[PDB]
DNA sequence: TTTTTT
């Protein structure tokens, strides 16, 4: 049973189709499936579904030395949570299905 | 030719609208006296200065919020007393069920004329406010602790039952049905709000207000009142130092701050505000800890200066009027 | 049977918007 | 042989339709001058750039929404003032009952010529807008806070009564009855919307706008205006930093953004927008914190550059024409 | 369609 194998909180788990290639070094590529657990609090270094200034993004969460959203691709650049930036984390990616 | 036809069509449309809906349905903004902003004193001169227009606007919605024991009820009762001193009729919807009539009387509120309601449900509270606005005989209405505006379904429910956003629905509908009635009857509706915590907020203000977002949009003036210290007569704490920050203003410039003392059993220290405003406006000279008015040394320290100024009414009124014509950006007619 | 939102989340750049027209499916039917 | 018969049949059908419904009932799209997109400035040059066509389209429907105190009414009043400077007639249907005529005058609006309506119900507001559109003498109509477009049934009802989607049906019927009238009369209808929270959203934007979904479909341009900072003169907050996102655009490319400063008592900072656009278009040199034009150091910082460009109208006009010629994708005739 | 809650 895959549901018992991969899902801990069935009532707070949704699937997301990945787009773009800024997470390739982190194991996420364009078209992949992202299983997101919205019932668990995000931590430093976790992979999260986040929205910056109302714009949704998949990124790695860092809280030190500053709050930022960093990708896992050398081509792309980190997103720094600047003044009047509302970083809304909508869950933590727990699994990537290719 | 074309301009004349356009003017004819515009006049015909205006007449049609006036016939269909009424005389005051549509008219030019310049000659609409019902849209002029009328304000009443809030009981604090510094707050009136920070509000720009001279006080809370009549016919609008005002939200006052802050932490526990920050003086929301005291400021509201001072506003009500100031309104009643002008002959207006005020109403108090005590949804928190935590009003002390004796303390309200001690602040100067005419208890015998203040309409007090302790509604069971939030719907009952908002319907009473709507009825009082529609009557037109009430000038100031206050909803104490809209956080306590619990819906009827929540009351009839159980503890732990999830009523998800029901209070938000009820409050949004209340604003929608109340804005026009308040504007029509020229009634000031003050909503008192408590501060809750936004969990999981990493960057930003972690404090939100109860009731949803409708009050944020509909309120003409939103005041964040906080206690920043204590007023001590040596040992006993006789008052509190209060800061009011105007986080929203639809009648003047926002983000101004007002600092004043709330003395227990007396209300807002008007004379202390007078001392501070005279000092700021170069009316009262301050040499270190020594305050002086026109060379005469009046006392040592803010408390002694305030006591001096209490002991004399004449230059009290003098400094008050000078400050009022100087600092007030928008003097009321 | 869990939501599979129609809109795709852009990992490269912050997507202009994210509507959530919700389509629901189970893991076993989706992968096997 | 066959093509001639087909052409004859098409011509006969076109003539029959023209006789039945009118001269302009049907015609080739290339020779239909009424379908051309005509635009008016929004009071913000960067927003005109972001809209592609140089401003909001005439004869269409535009929705403006955002959080509280984001500048919806100020942007609308700048649009109205820009229209009135061109001789157009504008109307303001304020459902919020929270319009300040003095501030509207301070933004450049001719309050002596702006039609203002305080509708009691949403149906009354939409009927007034329909009448103004059908007149053809009004160029810009604004509905303030369609969240306040309360149905008559809800007005006559009680607080807590459930009116499921009744406002949505009223808005849908209004859009259906208004689109054709606005297109025929070349009237721009701007809808101001508030933002409500969406409960139980696992993924996606948890914010909608009041009024239902018909306004989403019928709007030619939808703007998302937000306050992303404050403009400070050292200590006092004299303005707000605003970002406007074009989330929908039927006349140009969407999702373009504009940044401008809204100054209290003045409105959108046009000269700062000129500074920023000249800097972006390699017309004004920025060396760190130093702004220079053609070698001449105009000042230090955005505020000093704006003051200098205000002090020299000739160079301001020069840079304005250069920026308008260069940046504008669709320069209006 | 409607609207947060700690
Ligand atoms: N009857 C009273 N006599 C003397 N001091 C009082 C009395 N009631 C309140 N106070 C004090 O007056 C200050 C402000 O009181 P309030 O206006 O009730 O504060 P509040 O904003 O209403 O906060 P809440 O409603 O209790 S959560 C506090 O320091 C209180 O301790
Ligand atoms: N009369 C006024 N004098 C000075 N500043 C004002 C005045 N009215 C509004 N402002 C400020 O101008 C900015 C934009 O004002 P608005 O146009 O009313 O914003 P808004 O989008 O309409 O927000 P709402 O309608 O209250 S939800 C805000 O920072 C207001 O505080
Ligand atoms: Mg209270
Ligand atoms: Mg407004």
DSSP bridge pairs for D208: D196
Q: Is C13 helix (H, G, I), strand (E, B) or coil?
A: coil
Task: Give the number of whichever ligand sits closest to the CA of residue B65.
Answer: 1
* Whole-Å CA distances, B126 to B76, B129, B170, D95: 18, 5, 9, 20
Chain centre distance of CA B319? 25
D133's enclosing H/E stretch is: helix D122-135
Q: Cα–Cα distances in Å, from D171 out to B328, D123, D218?
A: 43, 9, 11
Q: Is B66 annotated in some ligand binding site?
A: yes
Cα separation values, A21 from A25, A76, D85, Å: 9, 9, 50
Q: Fold for domain D33-268? A: Rossmann fold (3.40.50)
Q: Is B241 part of any known ligand binding site? A: no
DSSP string, A42-85: --TT-EEEEEETTEEEEEEEE-SSS-EEE-S-SSS--EE--TT-
**Pair D303, D263: CB distance under 8 Å:** no
Residue D134 contacts residue B13 (beta carbons within 8 Å): yes
Distance CA A93, CA A95 (A): 6
List CB contacts (< 8 A) between B202 and chain A: 63, 67, 81, 87, 89
* D115 to B254: CB separation less than 8 angstroms, yes or no: no
Separation between Cα atoms, residue B265 and residue B259, nearest integer Å: 19
- The 3-state DSSP class for residue D173 equals helix
Compare all CA atoms of chain B with the CA of D263 and give the residue at the minimum distance: B253
Resolution (A): 3.3
D198 annotated ligand-binding residue: no
B68 touches ligand 1 (CB under 6 Å):
yes
With CB atoms and an 8 Å threshold, state whether B212 touches D200: no
Domain map (residue ranges) of chain B = 32-268, 270-324
Q: Do A14 and D203 touch (CB under 8 A)?
A: yes
List all residues 6 or more positions away from B101 whose beta carbon is below 8 Å from its beta carbon: B111, B116
CA D240 – CA D260 distance, rounded (Å): 9
Q: Is the CB of D74 under 6 A from ligand 2?
A: yes
Task: Tell me phi and psi for residue A38, to 5 degrees.
Answer: -90, 0
- Torsion, Cα B12 B17 B18 B24, to 10 degrees, reads -130
**CB neighbourhood size of B203 (10 A):** 15
Looking at domain B270-324, its CATH superfamily turns out to be RecA protein, C-terminal domain (3.30.250.10)
Residue with tokens 């721009």: D188
Which helix (H) or strand (E) segment holds residue B17: the answer is helix B2-21
> Per CATH, the architecture of B32-268 is what?
3-Layer(aba) Sandwich (3.40)
User: What CATH homologous superfamily does D270-325 map to?
Assistant: RecA protein, C-terminal domain (3.30.250.10)
C-alpha B35, offset from chain centre = 19
Contact D132, B9 (CB under 8 A): no
- Gaps in chain C with C–N over 2.5 Å, residue before each: none
Burial classification of residue D164, based on how many CB atoms lie within 10 Å of its CB (0-12 exposed, 13-18 middle, 19 or more buried): exposed
D197 touches strand E (CB under 7 A): yes
| Domain hosting residue A96, numbered range | 1-98
Specify the experimental method: cryo-EM
**Structural contact between residues D63 and D72, judged by C-beta atoms closer than 8 angstroms:** no
Q: Which residues of B touch D68 (CB under 8 A)?
A: 213, 216-217, 248
Dist CA B149 CA B171 (whole Å): 9
**Minimal CA–CA distance to C14: which of B277, A52, A82?**
A52
């Amino acid at each position: 049973d895959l549901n018992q194998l991969l899902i801990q909180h069935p009532s707070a788990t949704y699937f997301v189709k990945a787009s773009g290639d800024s997470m390739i070094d982190g194991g996420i590529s364009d078209g992949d499936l992202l299983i997101v657990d919205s019932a668990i609090t995000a931590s430093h270094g976790d992979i999260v579904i986040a929205a910056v200034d109302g714009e949704f993004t998949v990124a790695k969460l860092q809280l030190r030395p500053t709050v930022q959203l960093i990708p896992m691709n050398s081509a792309y650049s980190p997103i720094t949570i600047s003044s009047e930036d509302t970083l809304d984390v909508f869950g933590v990616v727990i699994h990537v299905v290719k | 030719a074309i301009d004349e036809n356009k003017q004819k069509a515009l006049a015909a449309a205006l007449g049609q609208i006036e016939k269909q809906f009424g005389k005051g349905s549509i008219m030019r903004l310049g000659e609409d006296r019902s849209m002029d902003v009328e304000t009443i004193s809030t009981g604090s001169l510094s707050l009136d200065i920070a509000l720009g227009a001279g006080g809370l606007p009549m016919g609008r919605i005002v939200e006052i919020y802050g932490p526990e024991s920050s003086g929301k009820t005291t400021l509201t009762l001072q506003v009500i007393a100031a309104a009643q001193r002008e002959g207006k009729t005020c109403a108090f919807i005590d949804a928190e069920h935590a009003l002390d009539p004796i303390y309200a009387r001690k602040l100067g509120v005419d208890i015998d004329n203040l309409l007090c309601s302790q509604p069971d449900t939030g719907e009952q509270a908002l319907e009473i406010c709507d009825a009082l606005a529609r009557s037109g005989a009430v000038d100031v209405i206050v909803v104490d602790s809209v956080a306590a505006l619990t819906p009827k379904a929540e009351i009839e429910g159980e503890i732990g039952d999830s009523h998800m956003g029901l209070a938000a629905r009820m409050m949004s509908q209340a604003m929608r049905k109340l804005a026009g009635n308040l504007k029509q009857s020229n009634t000031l509706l003050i909503f008192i709000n408590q501060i809750r915590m936004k969990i999981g907020v990493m960057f930003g203000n972690p404090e939100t207000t109860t009731g949803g977002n409708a009050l944020k949009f509909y309120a003409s003036v939103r005041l964040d009142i906080r206690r920043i210290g204590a007023v001590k007569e040596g040992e006993n704490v006789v008052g509190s130092e209060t800061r009011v920050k105007v986080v929203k203003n639809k009648i003047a410039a926002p983000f101004k701050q007002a600092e004043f003392q709330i003395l227990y059993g007396e209300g807002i220290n008007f004379y202390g505000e007078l001392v501070d405003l005279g000092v700021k406006e170069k009316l009262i000279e301050k040499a270190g800890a020594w305050y002086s008015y026109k060379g005469e040394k009046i006392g040592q320290g803010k408390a002694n200066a305030t006591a001096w100024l209490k002991d004399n009414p004449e230059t009290a009124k003098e400094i008050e009027k000078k400050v009022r014509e100087l600092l007030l950006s928008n003097p009321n007619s | 049977t869990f939501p599979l939102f129609s809109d795709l989340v852009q990992c490269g750049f912050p997507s202009p918007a994210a509507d959530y027209v919700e389509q629901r499916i189970d893991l076993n039917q989706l992968l096997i």
